[PDB]
Design a protein around this ligand. Sequence first.
Ligand code: LW0
Length: 260
Amino acid sequence: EPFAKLEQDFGGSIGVYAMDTGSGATVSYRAEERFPLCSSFKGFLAAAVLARSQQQAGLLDTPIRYGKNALVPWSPISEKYLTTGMTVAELSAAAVQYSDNAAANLLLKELGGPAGLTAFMRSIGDTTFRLDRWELELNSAIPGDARDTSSPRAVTESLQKLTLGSALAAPQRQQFVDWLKGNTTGNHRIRAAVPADWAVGDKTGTCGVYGTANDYAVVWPTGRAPIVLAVYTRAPNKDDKHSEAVIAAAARLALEGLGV
Ligand SMILES: O=C(N[C@@H]1C[C@H](c2nnn[nH]2)c2ccccc21)c1cccc(F)c1
C-alpha cells in the first residue's frame, strides 16, 4: 500500500526491486515493468568497458582523443579536456560519476554502439536490458517504447552480478564498486535514505520528460550482508516532472521492507 500511495501522490508509476543478498529477502513493486534507463545505462557501460579490460591490457590507460564534435550537452568533465584528451578509465569515471554524455558516447563507440553494450548484458544473463540509441536521443522516454529500457528487477540482478558476484574479475569488480562509490549525482536519491555510516555506490538517470528518473545502488550495511536495489519512475504526461524526493522515499520504503 505505501508504494501505491507514493506513486499516486507523485502522479505516475514507481518501480522498485531490492534484495538482501544475505537472506534473499526481497522488496518488489512493479519490478517487471520497463522504465527508461536514461543516464543510468552508464553504470553498465563502465562495467562493460571493465570486462573488456580483462582481455586488452592497458585498455583502461589507453588515451582517447576527441574534438569539439564529440562534445554533447552536459559533458562537464570531458569538455575541460577537449584540447587535451582523456583515458578510457577517466572517461568511464566521468560517465559514472558525473553522468558525462560525451564520455558515454565515446565509450559506446569503443564497444560497438548500443547493440554492443546490450550484447555485454546478454553475456551476464540479462535478457531484459536493451540500449538502442546514443546520447542524447536515448532519453526520449516515450510511453510504451521499449527502446533504451530495462526493469527494476533486471537492473538489480545485473548490478548484483557485477558488483558482488563473478561477472567481473575481482580487480575490475572493485574498480566498478569504487566508481559507483564516488558518484556525485545521487545525494538526493537512494543515498538520502541510506544510513550515514553505511557504504554506498549508485548511478542515477534523469530523462528530463515524462516524470522519468531513477537510481540504483549497492549498499554495504555494517554487520549484515549488502543490499542491492533499483528505483525507477515515469509518468504519463510529457510535461510531468520527475521528483528526487519520491526516489528517496521509495528507497526508504524498500529499506524498511528489508528491516532497515
Ligand atoms: O545538466 C543537465 N542534466 C544533467 C544530466 C546528469 C544526470 N541527471 N541524472 N543522472 N545524471 C546530471 C547530473 C547532475 C546535474 C545535471 C545533470 C541538463 C539540464 C537541462 C537540460 C539538459 F539537456 C541537461
